[PDB]
Amino acid sequence: MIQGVIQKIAGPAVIAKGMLGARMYDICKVGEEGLVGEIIRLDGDTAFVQVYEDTSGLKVGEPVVSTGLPLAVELGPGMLNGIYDGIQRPLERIREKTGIYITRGVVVHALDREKKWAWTPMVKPGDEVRGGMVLGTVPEFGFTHKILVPPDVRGRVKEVKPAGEYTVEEPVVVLEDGTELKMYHTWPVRRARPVQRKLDPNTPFLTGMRILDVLFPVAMGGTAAIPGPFGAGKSVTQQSLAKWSNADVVVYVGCGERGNEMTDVLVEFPELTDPKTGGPLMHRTVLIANTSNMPVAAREASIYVGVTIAEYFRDQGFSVALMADSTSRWAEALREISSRLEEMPAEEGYPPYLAARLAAFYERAGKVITLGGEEGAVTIVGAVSPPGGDMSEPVTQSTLRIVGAFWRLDASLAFRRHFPAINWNGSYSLFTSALDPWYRENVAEDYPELRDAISELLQREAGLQEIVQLVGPDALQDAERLVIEVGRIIREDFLQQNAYHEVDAYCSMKKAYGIMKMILAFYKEAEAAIKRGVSIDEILQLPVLERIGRARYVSEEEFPAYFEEAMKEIQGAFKALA
């Protein structure tokens, strides 16, 4: 191993001399306490090291040892139901070892080594194994964890251990060349894991939010960016994604954000139920936490660790949702390190390779055929925290060139307690056309037409609002006034959704379709009535409006009855006016 000594300490950066032979992007242990760092520059006999831990108290001349291997994660059973640091250290174990504060330098395995897993072989001696095949299986929490061959390993089976209870270290398959395959393998976090083929997204990433699911959808292997100013509802939206999404596994990455949010997830999820599996919600969740006051350089490590774990669970055949709590803080970490490197910045101090890093991160999403022949998918939702809500900033602009959906949060809507606070005028989705076949057979044959009609009504309202705000509602004609009123009904009764309500937190596609159909039926009857000379006030004072206005709080198990009754009542009421 290459050994050297510290020559210079500056914030999260250490320069080590005597490191001739150390490789780019290898892990080195800095100081007597063995702090983890990654080499990111070689110069003569020196190596520049970015340290993933606090550097206070280090002295010049302390040892620096290069491990010879890149930053890698352990990938195997034991990751579900867990919370990890940026470099994949179990935080429960860190607490048990160092109390309520995170002290630096703690060495602990990511996967528990004393746990026993029920192993069911799926291979026999003499079988040819290629990268990604399923050697066997172990139950985790109601999931069926498949033990995979590492991507770059080929051979023929020599012996298979029988069904039993084994730890993650036990060699469960031995090949002819002698290579021992265990329940886990290590993977570099900056190398994307290979796949057989990339597919075309054709199914929806159901979220539980009406606005995102209807107007601006995301496909099961797509990418979305949700930028917003502080106070708009990024965290609530992402937590709701985690609680209600139709993904098998959720990897939630708290990159440089509040620690109370991590505590909230840990405390709350163990009591909620997986929408599909039925078990506790925490059991489908992996948590990666590098809070704001944890070391800055570990934000990048957290992003890469999370995306690699998501790829792994995809490789087992799962649909994985990846939430990045803020890519803006990852950009901030890169800017800091480039300040230490003495690099020349691009716009706003960020390094010019920021867009390349973001692109590489987002391109790991996709629906794929795994090396094992099964279908997997990773869906990435990325939170961006532009300063001042400005969308003309490097991070938002670099993200918008690569994501397929743009969920734009608005502070004006959040000020009025309109949530989820998505600007439907400024948002878009490039998946709506591709998901139409799925909608036409899973929601309703005419669902896209209802959705288009609602979008057109909203566009008309947006056109009329500029006129109203300067000349008063009364100056309009009756048709335009009805459009304003129905646009308001859409805002308050369809677009708004209460994340803290026992029923309105989640909304199914059928319920959204029903609410839209009720709104459009009311609009058609109201237009007819206007032509029949009915007063706008009469229409507005009707009692059916209350029925539509409370429809989102009704529960799923009884909603279709409410829906049939309200559809009858709409005609009944507009016949009464005559």
């Binding site: 210079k8 300490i9 500056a10 320069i15 550097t55 206070s56 108290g57 280090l58 002295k59 010049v60 001349g61 935080l91 860190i94 607490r95 309520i100 504060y101 995170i102 100013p229 502080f230 106070g231 440089g256 509040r258 620690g259 109370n260 991590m262 505590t263 909230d264 840990l266 405390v267 936490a289 809070t291 704001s292 006051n293 944890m294 800055v296 803080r329 901030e332 800017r335 800091e336 480039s338 300040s339 910045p345 706003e348 101090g349 925290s385 300063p387 001042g388 809500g389 959040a414 000020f415 009025r416 307690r417 705000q469 300067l470 008063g472 009364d474 308050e492 803290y500 209350e546 206005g549």
Partner: protein, 468 residues
């Protein structure tokens, strides 16, 4: 126990000096810089190498020289001695008494920067603090363990609001259900760049209410060194965490004028030529502010707590300025004062729409306050937003053109501003604030209260504004 002295000063410029043979100075160590006249001034090591060590002098470098100046190590890690006997004392912003009293006997020395709290070691802030102010209690509720700043302006009365909250803050165990007798708040007060007028106001208020015995004061005045402004909140929060999580106290930290903290941070960053961010502020300002703000909360298995109420003056009343912008990304909501309400004569002039509390839901409702709190607050928000929109409409198209429902919303906006927001120096229990709220909501037709369930409307709707 021995003292090492370095005399190889090779370069002094601005607030930095280079020491040549200082390999045994750790990164982040504290040093004493002795001048030819024997005067000693502090400093921190900010970069170290085999060539030299870069030291950051806490006060001006006037009088230093390369011939008779020596640097001695003080501690490997910047630490602070803390004792329970800190309560009732005054310190100068670096930790030294300015009360004329003997120095404390430390029970322990704690690193001022602190250590991050493990997320698995935290518990959810859930205990509701009653501030006696309706705009906060009903709509922007504060809970123990929260970090809730006050977004202030130049000439606005944010100090008055902080003093009133400190005076009236209570926890109301009767609603929670524990039924045990309360305990009072310890106040840790950190002032950065504070003027004598404001310091006089605070000292007089605390003396008036008797809280100066159960409080710790760190006072960096606007005549005190600028780089020392960076140590003040860290020492304050070290003492706060010590008290809370070793002696089971409930501490209330007030950091007055965090704008001054950010200005000092920019001064240092510009000196070191680090990569800036948005308006000359250092690119790591977000992390630096987080290291201060995320030292609040509540821990599992501990009875004590740390609440933070930072006060920052928004430059040019601009909410998109980097200081307020980054604070709002870290803190759990914000209370924003309105220059317009202040000019109308309203106290406390808290604007609800740009104000938010993110931890309110975990502190209100069944078994905490009473069940209609959240819906009442939501309905008040909807009604006030509509009222402000109608007021915007009226300023163009005149009052006479309004429909009767819109006229109702206007009257609601006015009565809100004049009876809910405006309360002077009164202490209002949560019950009285909710009563006033339902009274204002009764001004609207019972059918327009879409945010409130039918049961609550039946229970509470219909009280007039006859409150006295």
């Amino acid at each position: 126990l021995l003292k090492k002295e370095y005399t190889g000063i090779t370069y002094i410029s601005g607030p930095l000096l280079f020491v040549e043979n200082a390999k045994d100075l750790a990164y982040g160590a504290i040093v004493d810089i002795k001048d030819g006249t024997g005067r000693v001034r502090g400093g921190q090591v900010i970069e170290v190498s085999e060539e030299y060590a870069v030291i950051q002098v806490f006060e001006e470098t006037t009088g230093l020289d390369l011939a008779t100046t020596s640097v001695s190590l003080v501690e490997d890690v910047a630490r602070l001695g803390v004792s329970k006997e800190m309560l009732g004392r005054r310190f100068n912003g670096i930790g030294k008494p300015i009360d004329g009293l003997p120095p404390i006997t430390p029970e322990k020395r704690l690193p001022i920067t602190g250590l991050p709290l493990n997320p698995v070691a935290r518990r959810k802030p859930e205990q509701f603090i009653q501030t006696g102010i309706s705009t906060i209690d009903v709509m922007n509720t504060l809970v123990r363990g929260q970090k809730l700043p006050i977004f202030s302006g130049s000439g606005l009365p944010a100090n008055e609001i902080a003093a009133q909250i400190a005076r009236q803050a209570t926890v109301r165990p009767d609603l929670s259900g524990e039924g045990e007798k309360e305990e009072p708040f310890a106040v840790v007060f950190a002032a950065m760049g504070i003027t004598q007028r404001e310091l006089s106001y605070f000292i007089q208020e605390f003396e008036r209410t008797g809280a100066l015995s159960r409080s710790v004061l760190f006072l960096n005045k606007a005549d005190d060194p600028t780089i020392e402004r960076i140590l003040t909140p860290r020492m304050a929060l070290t003492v706060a965490e010590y008290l809370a999580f070793e002696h089971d106290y409930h501490v209330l930290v007030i950091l007055t004028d965090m704008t001054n903290y950010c200005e000092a941070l920019r001064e240092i960053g510009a000196a070191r030529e680090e990569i800036p961010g948005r308006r000359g502020y250092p690119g790591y300002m977000y992390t630096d502010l987080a290291t201060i703000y995320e030292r609040a909360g509540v821990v599992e298995g501990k009875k004590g707590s740390v609440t933070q109420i930072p006060i920052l003056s928004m430059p040019d009343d601009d909410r998109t300025h980097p200081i307020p912008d980054l604070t709002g990304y870290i803190t759990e909501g914000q209370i924003q004062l309105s220059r317009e309400l202040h000019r109308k004569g309203i106290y406390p002039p808290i604007d609800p729409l740009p104000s938010l509390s993110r931890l309110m839901n975990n502190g209100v409702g069944k078994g905490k306050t009473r069940e209609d709190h959240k819906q009442v607050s939501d309905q008040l928000y909807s009604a006030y937003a509509n009222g402000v929109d109608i007021r915007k409409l009226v300023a163009i198209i005149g009052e006479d053109a309004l429909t009767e429902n819109d006229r109702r919303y206007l009257q609601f906006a006015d009565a809100f501003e004049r009876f809910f927001i405006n309360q002077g120096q009164q202490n209002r229990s949560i019950e009285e604030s909710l009563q006033i709220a339902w009274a204002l909501l009764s001004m609207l037709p019972q059918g327009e209260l879409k945010r409130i369930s039918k049961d609550h409307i039946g229970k509470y709707y219909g009280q007039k504004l006859e409150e006295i």
